[PDB]
Amino acid sequence: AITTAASRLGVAPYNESRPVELRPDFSLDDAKMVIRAVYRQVLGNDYIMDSERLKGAESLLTNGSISVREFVRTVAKSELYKKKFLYNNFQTRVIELNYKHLLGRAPFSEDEVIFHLDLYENQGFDADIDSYIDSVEYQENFGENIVPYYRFNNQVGDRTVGFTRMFRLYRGYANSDRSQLERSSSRLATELGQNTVSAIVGPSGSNAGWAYRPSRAGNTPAKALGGTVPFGQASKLFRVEITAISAPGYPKVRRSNKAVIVPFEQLNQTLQQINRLGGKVASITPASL
Amino acid sequence: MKTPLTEAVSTADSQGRFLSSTELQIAFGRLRQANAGLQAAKALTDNAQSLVNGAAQAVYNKFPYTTQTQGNNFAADQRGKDKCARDIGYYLRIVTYCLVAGGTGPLDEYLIAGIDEINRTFDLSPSWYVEALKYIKANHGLSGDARDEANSYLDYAINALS
Amino acid sequence: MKTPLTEAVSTADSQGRFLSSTELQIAFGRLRQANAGLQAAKALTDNAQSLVNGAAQAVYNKFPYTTQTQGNNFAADQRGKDKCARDIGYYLRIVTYCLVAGGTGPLDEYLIAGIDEINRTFDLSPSWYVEALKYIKANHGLSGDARDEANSYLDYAINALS
Amino acid sequence: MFDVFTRVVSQADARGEYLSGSQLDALSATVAEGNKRIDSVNRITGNASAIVSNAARALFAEQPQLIQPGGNAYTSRRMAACLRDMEIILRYVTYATFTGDASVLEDRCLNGLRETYVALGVPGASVAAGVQKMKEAALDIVNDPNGITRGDCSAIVAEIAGYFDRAAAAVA
Amino acid sequence: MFDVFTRVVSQADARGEYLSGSQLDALSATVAEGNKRIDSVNRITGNASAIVSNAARALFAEQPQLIQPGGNAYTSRRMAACLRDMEIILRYVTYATFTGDASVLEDRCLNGLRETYVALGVPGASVAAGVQKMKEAALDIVNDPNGITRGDCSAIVAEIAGYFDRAAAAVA
Amino acid sequence: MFDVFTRVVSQADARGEYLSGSQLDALSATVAEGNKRIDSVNRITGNASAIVSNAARALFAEQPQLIQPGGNAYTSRRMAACLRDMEIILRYVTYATFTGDASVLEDRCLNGLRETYVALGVPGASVAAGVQKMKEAALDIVNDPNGITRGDCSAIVAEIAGYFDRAAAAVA
Amino acid sequence: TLPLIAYAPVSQNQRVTNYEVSGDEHARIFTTEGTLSPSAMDNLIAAAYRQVFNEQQMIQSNRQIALESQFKNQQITVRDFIRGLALSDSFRRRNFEVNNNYRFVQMCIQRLLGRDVYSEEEKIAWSIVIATKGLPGFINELLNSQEYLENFGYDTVPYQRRRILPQRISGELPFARMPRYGADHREKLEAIGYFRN
Ligand SMILES: *[C@H](C)[C@H]1/C(=C/c2[nH]c(/C=C3N=C(/C=C4\NC(=O)C(CC)=C4C)C(C)=C\3CCC(=O)O)c(CCC(=O)O)c2C)NC(=O)[C@@H]1C
Ligand SMILES: *[C@H](C)[C@H]1/C(=C/c2[nH]c(/C=C3N=C(/C=C4\NC(=O)C(CC)=C4C)C(C)=C\3CCC(=O)O)c(CCC(=O)O)c2C)NC(=O)[C@@H]1C
Ligand SMILES: *[C@H](C)[C@H]1/C(=C/c2[nH]c(/C=C3N=C(/C=C4\NC(=O)C(CC)=C4C)C(C)=C\3CCC(=O)O)c(CCC(=O)O)c2C)NC(=O)[C@@H]1C
Ligand SMILES: *[C@H](C)[C@H]1/C(=C/c2[nH]c(/C=C3N=C(/C=C4\NC(=O)C(CC)=C4C)C(C)=C\3CCC(=O)O)c(CCC(=O)O)c2C)NC(=O)[C@@H]1C
Ligand SMILES: *[C@H](C)[C@H]1/C(=C/c2[nH]c(/C=C3N=C(/C=C4\NC(=O)C(CC)=C4C)C(C)=C\3CCC(=O)O)c(CCC(=O)O)c2C)NC(=O)[C@@H]1C
Ligand SMILES: *[C@H](C)[C@H]1/C(=C/c2[nH]c(/C=C3N=C(/C=C4\NC(=O)C(CC)=C4C)C(C)=C\3CCC(=O)O)c(CCC(=O)O)c2C)NC(=O)[C@@H]1C
Ligand SMILES: CCC1=C(C)/C(=C/C2=NC(=C\c3[nH]c(/C=C4\NC(=O)[C@H](C)[C@H]4CC)c(C)c3CCC(=O)O)/C(CCC(=O)O)=C2C)NC1=O
Ligand SMILES: CCC1=C(C)/C(=C/C2=NC(=C\c3[nH]c(/C=C4\NC(=O)[C@H](C)[C@H]4CC)c(C)c3CCC(=O)O)/C(CCC(=O)O)=C2C)NC1=O
Ligand SMILES: CCC1=C(C)/C(=C/C2=NC(=C\c3[nH]c(/C=C4\NC(=O)[C@H](C)[C@H]4CC)c(C)c3CCC(=O)O)/C(CCC(=O)O)=C2C)NC1=O
Ligand SMILES: CCC1=C(C)/C(=C/C2=NC(=C\c3[nH]c(/C=C4\NC(=O)[C@H](C)[C@H]4CC)c(C)c3CCC(=O)O)/C(CCC(=O)O)=C2C)NC1=O
Ligand SMILES: CCC1=C(C)/C(=C/C2=NC(=C\c3[nH]c(/C=C4\NC(=O)[C@H](C)[C@H]4CC)c(C)c3CCC(=O)O)/C(CCC(=O)O)=C2C)NC1=O
Ligand SMILES: CCC1=C(C)/C(=C/C2=NC(=C\c3[nH]c(/C=C4\NC(=O)[C@H](C)[C@H]4CC)c(C)c3CCC(=O)O)/C(CCC(=O)O)=C2C)NC1=O
Ligand SMILES: CCC1=C(C)/C(=C/C2=NC(=C\c3[nH]c(/C=C4\NC(=O)[C@H](C)[C@H]4CC)c(C)c3CCC(=O)O)/C(CCC(=O)O)=C2C)NC1=O
Ligand SMILES: CCC1=C(C)/C(=C/C2=NC(=C\c3[nH]c(/C=C4\NC(=O)[C@H](C)[C@H]4CC)c(C)c3CCC(=O)O)/C(CCC(=O)O)=C2C)NC1=O
Numbered sequence A: 001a002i003t004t005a006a007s008r009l010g011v012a013p014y015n016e017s018r019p020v021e022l023r024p025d026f027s028l029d030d031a032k033m034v035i036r037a038v039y040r041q042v043l044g045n046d047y048i049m050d051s052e053r054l055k056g057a058e059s060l061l062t063n064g065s066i067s068v069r070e071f072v073r074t075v076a077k078s079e080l081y082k083k084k085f086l087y088n089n090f091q092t093r094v095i096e097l098n099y100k101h102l103l104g105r106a107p108f109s110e111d112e113v114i115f116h117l118d119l120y121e122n123q124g125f126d127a128d129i130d131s132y133i134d135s136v137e138y139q140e141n142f143g144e145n146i147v148p149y150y151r152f153n154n155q156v157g158d159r160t161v162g163f164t165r166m167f168r169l170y171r172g173y174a175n176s177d178r179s180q181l182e183r184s185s186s187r188l189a190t191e192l193g194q195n196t197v198s199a200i201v202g203p204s205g206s207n208a209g210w211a212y213r214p215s216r217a218g219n220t221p222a223k224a225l226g227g228t229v230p231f232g233q234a235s236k237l238f239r240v241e242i243t244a245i246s247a248p249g250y251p252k253v254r255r256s257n258k259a260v261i262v263p264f265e266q267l268n269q270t271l272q273q274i275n276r277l278g279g280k281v282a283s284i285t286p287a288s289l
Numbered sequence B, C: 001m002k003t004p005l006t007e008a009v010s011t012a013d014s015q016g017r018f019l020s021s022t023e024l025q026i027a028f029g030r031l032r033q034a035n036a037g038l039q040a041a042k043a044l045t046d047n048a049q050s051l052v053n054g055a056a057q058a059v060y061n062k063f064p065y066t067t068q069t070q071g072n073n074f075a076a077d078q079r080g081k082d083k084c085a086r087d088i089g090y091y092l093r094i095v096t097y098c099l100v101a102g103g104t105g106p107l108d109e110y111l112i113a114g115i116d117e118i119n120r121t122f123d124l125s126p127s128w129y130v131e132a133l134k135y136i137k138a139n140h141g142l143s144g145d146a147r148d149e150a151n152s153y154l155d156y157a158i159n160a161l162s
Numbered sequence D, E, F: 001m002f003d004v005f006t007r008v009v010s011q012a013d014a015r016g017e018y019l020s021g022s023q024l025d026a027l028s029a030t031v032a033e034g035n036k037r038i039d040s041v042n043r044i045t046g047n048a049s050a051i052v053s054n055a056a057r058a059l060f061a062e063q064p065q066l067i068q069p070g071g072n073a074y075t076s077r078r079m080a081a082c083l084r085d086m087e088i089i090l091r092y093v094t095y096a097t098f099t100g101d102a103s104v105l106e107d108r109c110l111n112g113l114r115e116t117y118v119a120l121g122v123p124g125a126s127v128a129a130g131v132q133k134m135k136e137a138a139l140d141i142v143n144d145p146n147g148i149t150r151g152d153c154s155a156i157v158a159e160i161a162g163y164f165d166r167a168a169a170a171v172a
Numbered sequence G: 001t002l003p004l005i006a007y008a009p010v011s012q013n014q015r016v017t018n019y020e021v022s023g024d025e026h027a028r029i030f031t032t033e034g035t036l037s038p039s040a041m042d043n044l045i046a047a048a049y050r051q052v053f054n055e056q057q058m059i060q061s062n063r064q065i066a067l068e069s070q071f072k073n074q075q076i077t078v079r080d081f082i083r084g085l086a087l088s089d090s091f092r093r094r095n096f097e098v099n100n101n102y103r104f105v106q107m108c109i110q111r112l113l114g115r116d117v118y119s120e121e122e123k124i125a126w127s128i129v130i131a132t133k134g135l136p137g138f139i140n141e142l143l144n145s146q147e148y149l150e151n152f153g154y155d156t157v158p159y160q161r162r163r164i165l166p167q168r169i170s171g172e173l174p175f176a177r178m179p180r181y182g183a184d185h186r187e188k189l190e191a192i193g194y195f196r197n
Helices: A028-041 A055-062 A068-077 A079-086 A091-103 A110-133 A136-141 A160-169 A189-193 A267-277 B004-014 B021-046 B048-062 B078-101 B105-112 B115-121 B126-139 B145-161 C004-014 C021-046 C048-062 C078-101 C105-110 C115-121 C126-138 C145-161 D004-015 D021-046 D048-062 D075-099 D103-108 D113-120 D124-142 D154-169 E006-014 E021-046 E048-062 E076-099 E103-108 E113-120 E124-142 E154-169 F004-015 F021-046 F048-062 F076-099 F103-109 F113-120 F124-142 F154-169 G038-052 G065-072 G078-086 G089-096 G101-113 G120-144 G146-152 G183-192
Strands: A237-243 A258-263 A280-286
Touching: A028 A055, A028 A068, A055 A068, A068 A079, A068 A091, A068 A110, A079 A091, A091 A110, A091 A136, A091 A160, A110 A189, A160 A189, A237 A267, A258 A267, A267 A280, A280 E113, B004 B021, B004 C004, B004 C021, B004 D004, B004 D075, B004 D103, B021 B048, B021 B078, B021 B145, B021 C004, B021 C021, B021 C145, B021 D021, B048 B078, B048 B126, B078 B105, B078 B126, B078 B145, B078 D004, B105 B145, B105 D004, B105 E076, B115 B145, B115 E048, B115 E076, B126 B145, B145 C021, B145 F021, B145 F048, C004 C021, C004 F004, C004 F076, C004 F103, C004 G120, C021 C048, C021 C078, C021 C145, C021 F021, C048 C078, C048 C126, C078 C105, C078 C126, C078 C145, C078 F004, C105 C145, C105 F004, C115 C145, C126 C145, C145 D021, C145 D048, D004 D021, D021 D048, D021 D075, D021 D124, D021 D154, D048 D075, D048 D124, D075 D103, D075 D124, D075 D154, D075 G065, D103 D154, D113 D124, D124 D154, E006 E021, E021 E048, E021 E076, E021 E124, E021 E154, E048 E076, E048 E124, E076 E103, E076 E124, E076 E154, E103 E154, E113 E124, E124 E154, F004 F021, F004 G183, F021 F048, F021 F076, F021 F124, F021 F154, F048 F076, F048 F124, F076 F103, F076 F124, F076 F154, F076 G120, F103 F154, F113 F124, F113 G120, F124 F154, G038 G065, G038 G078, G038 G101, G065 G078, G078 G101, G078 G120, G078 G146, G089 G101, G101 G120, G101 G146, G120 G146
Parallel strands: none
Antiparallel strands: A237 A258, A237 A280
């Protein structure tokens, strides 16, 4: 599991939280807790007012007229889910949102986006939502009676790209998917088309450099192609991701977030210049071998 | 680390060119001296325990004050003597690494870089390790090109400490 | 202007350090190559006139248009032929300089640096000098150790011009 | 970077042990292979421009989609980039042959080349085909028996083939 | 970057209000505690090398895995970097004690320290244990009665302990 | 910079002809002399710190006005600067012995050192005296017959002496 | 090591605050912070070559091919590319080997910090940085210098700073004028046998 970095990455409130399962002869507070867990997960921790509470699907779940899987399906078919996530977003953003909500994980490969977008355009949003719900992964993870939940831990049949893209999608326990730095932009278009992985930046509070997002162009690549040769005498190279540089000003600082590859011997100086600048280090990744 | 081959490649590669005749005879000198270096490393590996114990005894003879008076930085008790033997074993092992590699690169990235703050922070006199390396110079038992390669790494550690 | 000795000294100066055993091995390879390099340079010094004349004739045989059409860059007149023989003599003399020095440094500071603008400004084809150095490779008459050392500089000027 | 000596020196330092006798005999065997290694480095260095030019010409003859108008090797800047990519890959193969260890080829040549080629749209399969053409050209030049003393040289040829395999695998 | 007055200034300006009488009286009490604050800074500064050396010795007696070969504190370069990190963390704890606010500590020392230590493979719990040993040495040296006029110094010492705990928590 | 080969090469190129036969024989005699040259370089490098320490001790014992208060070698920064100056001069003397030519010594160490010492107030006569004491120590350790095969090294000793004399004349 | 010996600053135009609009005689900012075309990246690389090597050593043999290729891919910043130009073999042989430490300090301060040396004392102070730390140590000191940063930072090609004042036809002499070597290496080349007729 995730133990040491759980507090930093926000995994710990989901580490001590067990999956919510409705028993076959369930109590009323069990149905209410399934309702609350579904409204937190499927609607992505958005604030839900009483006007949009979806009383019909709640009432069908409360007497067992529908299951938890059918309740998740109903609240994903609803106009509230569509106006939260579908109508004002790119289709890749919608696909990764449905993956985070209904399956609790980030999309793995480009082929999943291909399948879901082709099925949406071929058969619409409801058909696509049904495909997330009627997936083998949904049954081996949640089935019929368990509310979907975020799956940060390693399971059978996952991919390690999904672990990094999960924190590209999950931005903290105090956070909703609509309330993130890319306001409507899909976070995995350049990560799934290029099949690349950006470094995991944790949420706010625990991580001072929480606000690093990469630009659409002019980004330093992750691996140092070249090694120590442009830097003279060096041993190891590290990509430092730096957030919120504002001490010199606009002529000097054009971009708040800067990613640079620096050696060991320049590491102290680089760290010192970040501190002097007032910048925040998001992550440091070993760029060379 | 710093060897003839890695300096040749790093030179030709910071220059951004193929390996010319200069780097090729750098490799030729490496092959010319490397067999004697490996034999010197084999002999020092064979005599390492006796050389380290004799070097420690030479330190305790020239500098007897590390044996009587107390303190963490001295070898009065058993654990100070154990750490002194470990330090001299480190020195001799990196000398064997330098004889294998063909340069003071193992000494630089393993022992020489940082040893000044080692001797300053923990109050270790560098003259102790100087006398240990002079005892290794006295009784390593090598002759010819194996002797001058071994003595060059020892005196490189002498000149860094002194 | 790079040799094994100058590169070794400039490297140890770049770290600001004394000459370790790596630099001594570099000089060892320089010594073991230098006698064959000087013998090759002496043999090319003896055969220089016939080598330049034959190389120029091979260039005019492979490229007859240099001796047929008019132009400043061509060898149709005596002035162009004298310039071509002077050029090939420069190539052979700097190859002997590389053989004496033990590295491509005489080529890199005397002929290779800026040769593209030489060939581009004055409309000289690098393939002419490639054919001349290929004749020098074919008929230098050296064998064994001095052959591979001399052909290293000759092929280095081939790879620079092509 | 590491060579054939500092690789086992670094393993011995991480293990905290001296070099064992079998390691010293293996290093003596590499010393015995070293003259043949120097000949291989000298031959690829001497014929490097011919290897790069002939491999590029064979690659563009076999794959005209690179050099077509709109292609990835189209115009002067992209062609110069492709030719220096062959030049650099051949140079680091000679470097790894020289050191006897792929650490210079792993770190200073191929660490991030596939991701760079994917990001630019460079076809890594065509680069791999060009690396295989440099493989066959360089191995034909090293295995040329004329003008050199005879001897068994299959080990250094297999090492160079492994370095070229590593260069071809790391681009696609 | 803030000190004990500048933090209150920034909070009051972010609220857009003058400092209330309670805040002015709290800062006056801080000015009263300032002489003991200067004494604590002076004592840790004057015994910094003793704190770093004794904390390193206690840490590597408790954790001999670091100094054995194959360990992080093994070799003079890595141990020199380790002792440099010990004195750097002690230096910024003294800076935070001097300022009365931990903005210099969390902004100029612990900024990216855990990312650096994870990327280097530096054991952050070992650095945290060394920071706790520096904490024990520093709160022993500051609480020494001899050589200084007596008085109650619970608050400044608790503030120093809080600085050491947020230094250890930022690397763990 | 030049070496013993490239000095001859540069003179032959500047005059504009090939090397003569006798010039090649002189260079071959230098090549035969090179093993004793490498021995002298190795000995000076191996006892460089002893040379600098003993020569500085004898220099500040022969003339005490440099280490007197108000003197140039007074203060720890200026004393470390003087020891470092002797270290550097001995290093470039070793470099010039290695190359077989005084080009690295004259170009890198001795070019403009006199006016720099005049502008700093550094006494160049005392620097020349320290260089002469390093000459005495270096010629003592090069001509030491112990631990080496016997042979005549008069030209190497004279070359090191000439390098030291032109180092002492460049500051006096 | 040792701390640099103190040198007094001599008044130069870059010391005072610039009360100007950039206009005609401003040195153009060659920066990678804005996303550039490959042509604009090529002119930026040529500007770095013109600053470090001057116009004369812009030849194909002095082009750092792998450094250019890494710089295009943004593996390195502009400051690291300037370092690689200063650590280049051609720069070391052409400029560093033909000069003493004093004139090389003056050359590197002019071509990296964009300002002249204050006096002979600054050349003296950084020449021992050369003599102990090598050329890489010295270049690194100059490139980590706050001056280099507050002026050019990490992503701008260095330029001569405040060469000419507003409404002045002429100002300070351009840095391009300074030769690879001074009169000492000139007369040493004359003494070895060159340059005579
Ligand atoms: C047709 C004129 C050109 C062309 C198209 C092409 N497109 C793709 C792939 C994708 N296109 C999209 C676009 C959208 N996603 C959305 O959500 C929306 C609005 C709702 C749009 C318009 C996406 C997401 C993809 C990725 C999924 C997929 O691969 O199908 C491809 C295939 C991508 C590939 O190269 O593998 C192609 C070929 N190609 C052309 O040459 C024409 C210029
Ligand atoms: C104005 C309507 C709003 C506002 C602005 C505000 N901006 C900053 C700071 C910065 N702005 C930039 C922007 C750019 N970098 C570029 O390269 C370009 C185009 C070339 C632009 C436009 C940058 C780099 C900074 C930081 C550096 C600097 O200080 O100049 C601030 C200051 C924030 C701070 O000091 O931390 C502010 C206030 N603020 C508002 O409230 C309006 C909505
Ligand atoms: C001979 C193979 C063919 C040929 C040659 C030709 N060359 C030139 C002119 C020049 N050649 C050089 C070359 C060098 N100068 C150097 O200093 C060095 C390094 C030592 C080299 C290699 C230069 C600089 C020139 C121009 C300056 C000059 O005239 O000396 C010419 C004349 C070109 C002209 O326009 O005047 C010719 C004809 N021509 C052939 O047809 C042969 C096949
Ligand atoms: C014509 C005047 C003479 C001639 C030409 C010839 N050219 C080539 C090969 C190449 N030419 C280029 C040039 C460009 N490629 C570009 O992308 C651009 C910018 C848009 C230019 C100017 C290139 C890259 C090649 C090589 C790759 C390829 O084959 O496409 C050849 C073939 C060389 C070969 O070895 O295969 C020839 C013959 N030849 C003549 O005799 C004419 C006098
Ligand atoms: C005394 C506690 C112990 C002792 C001392 C001892 N010191 C030296 C030599 C030197 N000391 C210095 C120190 C300074 N010089 C300075 O300018 C300053 C700053 C003002 C300081 C601190 C220096 C430079 C020397 C060497 C030069 C010189 O001789 O003046 C020696 C002599 C060493 C020698 O080899 O000649 C001694 C003996 N020795 C002890 O046993 C005491 C325990
Ligand atoms: C030729 C076989 C194929 C080809 C090549 C091509 N490559 C590039 C661009 C780059 N190549 C590299 C690789 C390296 N740079 C280094 O320094 C090193 C190690 C020292 C390596 C391995 C890089 C970094 C680039 C980008 C930077 C640059 O442009 O120099 C291009 C240009 C792509 C573009 O449009 O920008 C091309 C065309 N292309 C082919 O089609 C062949 C299969
Ligand atoms: C499908 C391929 C795949 C891989 C490879 C993978 C790696 C992987 N290793 C993890 C954790 C881990 N891995 C280790 C491993 C080690 N700790 C050490 O000290 C040793 C050096 C080392 C053993 C060699 C540890 C200790 C954790 C748990 C970290 C934590 O507690 O937070 C996790 C966190 C998720 C989880 O544990 O459930 C992942 C995803 N996940 C995948 O899907
Ligand atoms: C872990 C427990 C937890 C926290 C802390 C939390 C915070 C939280 N506050 C939110 C929104 C919000 N919060 C505010 C609050 C304010 N606006 C103001 O002007 C005032 C200064 C302030 C009240 C004092 C507003 C206005 C929004 C809605 C923003 C919008 O939809 O446009 C949202 C967005 C989703 C939603 O609207 O439900 C979250 C997630 N949510 C949580 O589950
Ligand atoms: C500075 C330029 C220079 C170089 C590069 C050089 C290399 C060199 N290669 C050698 C041997 C050799 N080279 C080879 C190589 C091969 N044999 C083959 O049939 C294969 C085609 C080929 C592999 C590419 C062999 C087998 C030996 C003899 C075994 C050995 O000496 O290791 C020798 C021993 C002396 C001799 O017998 O010729 C030298 C000096 N000498 C120089 O002065
Ligand atoms: C591989 C490179 C390398 C070197 C060289 C090295 C040296 C080294 N020697 C040390 C200690 C020590 N070294 C000695 C040595 C001696 N005391 C004496 O009286 C004798 C005269 C003398 C032996 C010649 C002692 C007593 C200590 C313990 C100091 C202490 O605990 O305070 C320590 C302190 C950490 C520890 O206790 O292990 C280091 C790092 N460490 C390294 O990683
Ligand atoms: C801005 C303030 C600042 C911080 C925070 C800082 C931390 C810092 N510690 C480092 C290394 C290091 N730190 C340690 C420390 C330790 N190893 C252990 O085993 C112990 C648990 C521990 C000491 C108790 C070691 C061993 C290295 C070197 C790692 C290596 O060389 O691979 C490095 C890498 C660069 C270098 O070595 O100089 C940095 C930047 N440097 C700064 O300037
Ligand atoms: C420039 C160097 C310098 C310093 C640092 C300095 C500090 C200093 N500390 C003082 C007091 C003091 N210092 C302490 C501190 C303590 N008392 C204890 O029993 C604890 C062990 C300890 C906490 C670490 C106390 C209690 C006072 C008296 C109360 C006060 O003046 O604030 C005083 C008041 C004068 C006096 O009574 O001595 C000064 C001037 N003066 C100087 O010239
Ligand atoms: C990498 C370290 C290393 C070095 C430096 C080295 C030097 C070295 N010096 C040699 C010879 C020699 N060295 C000397 C030198 C001298 N004779 C004297 O009586 C004078 C005191 C002194 C001048 C300083 C002489 C005379 C020879 C024999 C002649 C010759 O080989 O050139 C030899 C030939 C083999 C031998 O007979 O020992 C070698 C290999 N070998 C190595 O492995
Ligand atoms: C933008 C205004 C400007 C100009 C024009 C200028 C000229 C100039 N010409 C130089 C060299 C040179 N200039 C020449 C020119 C000639 N040599 C001859 O024999 C012919 C008479 C003449 C050709 C017409 C040569 C050959 C060199 C090379 C000197 C050398 O590098 O050794 C150099 C030094 C090269 C360097 O530092 O790398 C400069 C600065 N400086 C400036 O600021």
